[PDB]
Amino acid sequence: WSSTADPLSNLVLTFSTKEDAVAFAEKNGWSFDVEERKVPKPKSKSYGANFSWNKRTRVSTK
């Protein structure tokens, strides 16, 4: 079996904002590293672009 020796292996905490997580970590005395949120960029979708007269976006099959 898979044995461990640290009690915090399964400890995961959930917060609504990053500031709350930072405050919790600071008040508990843990040193932290924070990663900023990665949000997908807004995309420009056009169905008609699949059938362009002169552009490269015209598809070859559906």
Binding site: S52, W53, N54, K55, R56, R58, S60
Partner: protein, 43 residues
């Protein structure tokens, strides 16, 4: 003037290449085609 006869009898002697032979003959009468600007969408 008559109506007892059937006039569409030419299609009784059409071969397998009649349509494409007609297309070849008509090729000389067509206007120049427009160009999209590229050779293909994959170019």
């Amino acid at each position: 003037f008559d109506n007892s006869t059937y006039r569409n009898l030419q299609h009784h002697e059409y071969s397998t290449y009649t349509f494409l032979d007609l297309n070849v003959e008509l090729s000389k009468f067509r206007m120049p085609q427009p160009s999209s600007g590229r050779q293909s969408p994959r170019h």
